[PDB]
Design an enzyme around this catalytic site. Structure first.
Site, PDB file in Angstrom:
ATOM      1  CD  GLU A  66      43.063  79.899  -0.753  1.00 59.59           C
ATOM      2  OE1 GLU A  66      43.681  80.520  -1.647  1.00 59.59           O
ATOM      3  OE2 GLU A  66      43.563  78.950  -0.103  1.00 59.59           O
ATOM      4  CG  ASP A 122      45.642  88.535   3.385  1.00 60.10           C
ATOM      5  OD1 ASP A 122      45.047  87.444   3.294  1.00 60.10           O
ATOM      6  OD2 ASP A 122      46.785  88.660   3.869  1.00 60.10           O
TER       7      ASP A 122
END
Ligand SMILES: CCC(=O)N[C@@H](Cc1nc2ccc(C(C)C)cc2s1)C(=O)N[C@H](CNC(=O)/C=C/CN1CCOCC1)C1CCCCC1
Length: 357
Positions: A16, A25
């Site tokens: 990740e 995000d």
């Protein structure tokens, strides 16, 4: 909590990625995908981060701080899996290494996304590792993230950390070819030259600058071990040949104006000297010739104007606005708004340029 996760932090740091500064995000996030708030307020996001860490972080944390946050998310993920009737039996039946691979899937696509793999989860519960490995490779999950997915599938297939251990071995061996003899933790002048030679590229070429953008490298003529490791892993490359094969895809990306704007603004930050807010004129001209080549009609006249009438540092806002100027400016400059908020430097350039048509 200590009675209850050592390899899981490194597994997801690889898969990740680890971010030390508050990022946007597709939501306010930090570390390995840690959500700070659902609020659109950065003041709220920093407040939550400061409360969670126990200091005024100003949106910047250490790896150890990111680890503390990660351990909380692992524990929350484990609680969620166990409350899920579709995931609990498979989780319970699995050994420590394979549980870590299942938590990895939960971290990526959430519980509902994982519960969708009914046929595969059954095979895992049944310990039919070969059948499960083949079945998981057929999904869209395998195409969306082929490098990450192959690693997680290998973990389920073998019950070992070999996929992660072997990637790190391959990258560590490759790194040793470039590391500075006077400083093991970085790639020096010689190393950067060798890296570029191996890619059959000149170190002052546009292709190398596109690579720097993709690696999110901090500064020209500098290249940290962390930059190399994270860059190679995020790009799914474990050799020079794999990175070489990624260059055309990076080039195609820049044909889209959004990506080109991101790369153009990144160039300024990369080109400048650490400790200085502006970019020296000679340096600004050298990078402008590279990134604005075939995009700005007045590039040479702009360079001549600056070397003779500016003869000083270029601020970030001026650098950024030059791209907007190059896009809109008519070939005869007739559409230039002399009272349209451009930096004074660009008003001065249009006044200097217009008599010469
Ligand atoms: C266009 C890519 C680009 O920035 N290259 C760096 C070099 C590179 N940096 C990185 C950093 C990271 C990585 C990674 C992503 C693989 C690749 C590289 S390759 C360059 O030549 N920078 C000069 C400027 N600076 C210098 O000339 C500095 C010289 C150093 N001193 C001390 C040693 O003796 C000489 C003087 C300009 C590049 C553009 C044209 C004008 C010169």
């Amino acid at each position: 909590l200590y009675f209850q996760a050592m390899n899981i932090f490194e597994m997801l740091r690889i898969d990740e990625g680890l971010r030390l500064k508050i990022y946007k995000d597709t939501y306010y996030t930090i570390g390995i995908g840690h959500l700070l708030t659902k609020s659109p307020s950065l003041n709220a996001a920093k407040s939550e981060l400061d409360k969670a860490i126990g200091r005024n972080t100003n949106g910047v944390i250490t790896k150890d701080e990111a680890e503390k946050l990660f351990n909380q998310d692992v524990d929350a993920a484990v609680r969620g899996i166990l409350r899920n009737a579709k995931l609990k039996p498979v989780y319970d039946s699995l050994d420590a290494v394979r549980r870590a691979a299942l938590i990895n899937m939960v971290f990526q696509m959430g519980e509902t996304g994982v519960a969708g793999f009914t046929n595969s989860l059954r095979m895992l519960q049944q310990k039919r590792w070969a059948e499960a490995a083949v079945n998981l490779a057929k999904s869209r999950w395998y195409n969306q993230t082929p490098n990450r997915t192959k690693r997680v599938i290998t973990t389920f297939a073998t019950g070992t950390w070999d996929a992660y251990k072997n990637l790190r071995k391959k990258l560590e061996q490759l790194y040793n070819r470039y590391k500075d003899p006077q400083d093991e933790n970085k790639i020096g002048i010689d190393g950067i030259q060798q890296f570029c030679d191996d890619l059959a590229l000149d170190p002052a070429s546009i292709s190398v600058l596109i690579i720097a953008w993709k690696f999110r490298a901090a500064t020209q003529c500098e290249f940290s071990k962390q930059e190399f490791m994270d860059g190679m892993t995020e790009l799914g490359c474990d050799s020079i040949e794999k990175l070489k094969a990624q260059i055309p895809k990076m080039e195609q990306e820049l044909k889209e104006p959004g990506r080109f704007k991101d790369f153009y603004q990144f160039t300024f930050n990369f080109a400048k000297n650490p400790g200085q807010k502006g970019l020296d004129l000679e340096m600004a001209i050298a990078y402008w010739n590279l990134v604005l080549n075939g995009r700005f009609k007045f590039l040479d006249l702009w360079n001549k104007f600056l070397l003779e009438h500016h003869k000083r540092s270029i601020p970030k806002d001026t650098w950024n606005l030059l791209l907007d100027f190059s896009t809109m400016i008519a070939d005869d400059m007739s559409n230039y708004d002399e009272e349209g908020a451009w930096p004074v430097l660009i008003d001065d350039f249009v006044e200097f340029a217009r008599p010469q048509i």
